[PDB]
Enzyme design. Structure first.
Site, PDB file in Angstrom:
ATOM      1  CG  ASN A   1     132.001  99.910  25.475  1.00 38.92           C
ATOM      2  OD1 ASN A   1     131.067 100.713  25.328  1.00 38.92           O
ATOM      3  ND2 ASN A   1     132.391  99.065  24.507  1.00 38.92           N
TER       4      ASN A   1
ATOM      5  CE  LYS B   1     134.629  95.314  24.607  1.00 32.35           C
ATOM      6  NZ  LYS B   1     136.057  95.396  24.256  1.00 32.35           N
TER       7      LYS B   1
ATOM      8  CG  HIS C   1     133.420 101.177  20.969  1.00 34.80           C
ATOM      9  ND1 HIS C   1     133.711  99.861  20.677  1.00 34.80           N
ATOM     10  CD2 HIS C   1     134.195 101.511  22.023  1.00 34.80           C
ATOM     11  CE1 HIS C   1     134.617  99.416  21.527  1.00 34.80           C
ATOM     12  NE2 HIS C   1     134.923 100.396  22.358  1.00 34.80           N
TER      13      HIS C   1
ATOM     14  CD  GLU D   1     131.820  98.121  18.303  1.00 35.35           C
ATOM     15  OE1 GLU D   1     132.852  98.097  19.000  1.00 35.35           O
ATOM     16  OE2 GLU D   1     130.856  98.874  18.528  1.00 35.35           O
TER      17      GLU D   1
ATOM     18  CD  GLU E   1     137.867 102.684  23.049  1.00 39.57           C
ATOM     19  OE1 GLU E   1     137.065 102.537  22.108  1.00 39.57           O
ATOM     20  OE2 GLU E   1     137.843 102.048  24.115  1.00 39.57           O
TER      21      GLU E   1
ATOM     22  N   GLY F   1     140.686  95.117  23.099  1.00 37.13           N
ATOM     23  CA  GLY F   1     140.363  93.706  23.320  1.00 37.13           C
ATOM     24  C   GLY F   1     141.438  92.692  22.964  1.00 37.13           C
TER      25      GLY F   1
ATOM     26  CB  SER G   1     144.687  96.240  26.080  1.00 40.72           C
ATOM     27  OG  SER G   1     144.130  95.368  25.118  1.00 40.72           O
TER      28      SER G   1
END
Ligand SMILES: [Cl-]
Length: 238
Positions: free
Chosen positions: A10, A12, A86, A88, A158, A164, A204
């Protein structure tokens, strides 16, 4: 008896890496076992990534498209996968369970394979509301789909606190989460569907942690940040 694993990368912004070089690395990587690898990228890198990623066990995924014409156009462009929901999108952009659900329905209708993301917050995890949060999230998705539609769907579990942050879920936490997701899909959609469904872990994941996580009964691969360790995450999917 596990379905085909997926190793999804993914993309970013403000990744320290060169996307091109990462694509070059992925292109050189021999992958002996059966696994669908996915490079999910932001709009502005879709053309470059398609241009340049030629590993056949790899597919390009769009991210977050929600427009009929844009889904249709991506499909035209040869992009068949999309990541949606996702973290965010939910905690930042305000995409509700329903907005994500409608995006997932629209993408399926447009012929996309969909990686639909779900997952609880730190606070939701801490107060023991993981199950209700994540089952509410997927329930919204399931409401908009039909049984046949699940063939096109992949669930990325997730924890938001794991994305992250360097704080991965433990194999037991990822397994607990995946198991209840699949139990719910089993009971509410069918055990054939639960049986075939790829539930991926993300947040992570790295080389060392991945293979222990993949060992888990209900983990069918990973959603991971596009970084050179992704190659080792691919290898862990056995
Ligand atoms: Cl391999």
């Amino acid at each position: 008896s596990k379905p085909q694993p997926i190793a999804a990368a993914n993309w970013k912004s403000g990744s320290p890496d060169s996307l091109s070089e990462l694509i070059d690395l992925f292109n050189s990587t021999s992958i002996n076992h059966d696994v669908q690898c996915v490079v999910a990228s932001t709009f502005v890198h879709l053309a470059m990534t398609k241009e340049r990623l030629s590993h056949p066990k790899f597919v390009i995924a769009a991210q977050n498209a929600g427009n009929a014409d844009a889904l249709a156009s991506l499909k035209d462009f040869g992009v068949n996968w999309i990541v949606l929901g996702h973290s965010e999108r939910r905690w930042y952009y305000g995409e509700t369970n329903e907005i994500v659900a409608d995006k997932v329905a629209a993408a399926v209708a447009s012929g996309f394979m969909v990686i639909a993301c779900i997952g609880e917050t730190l606070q939701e995890r801490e107060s023991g509301r993981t199950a209700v949060v994540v089952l509410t999230q997927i329930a919204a998705i399931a409401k908009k789909l039909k049984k046949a539609d699940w063939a096109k769907v992949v669930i990325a579990y997730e924890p938001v606190w794991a994305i992250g942050t360097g704080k991965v879920a433990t194999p037991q936490q990822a397994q607990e989460a995946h198991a209840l997701i699949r139990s719910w899909v089993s009971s509410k959609i069918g055990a054939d569907v639960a049986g075939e469904l790829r539930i991926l872990y993300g947040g992570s994941v790295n080389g060392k942690n991945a293979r222990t996580l993949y060992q888990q009964r209900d983990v069918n691969g990973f959603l991971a940040g596009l970084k050179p360790e992704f190659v080792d995450i691919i290898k862990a999917t056995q």
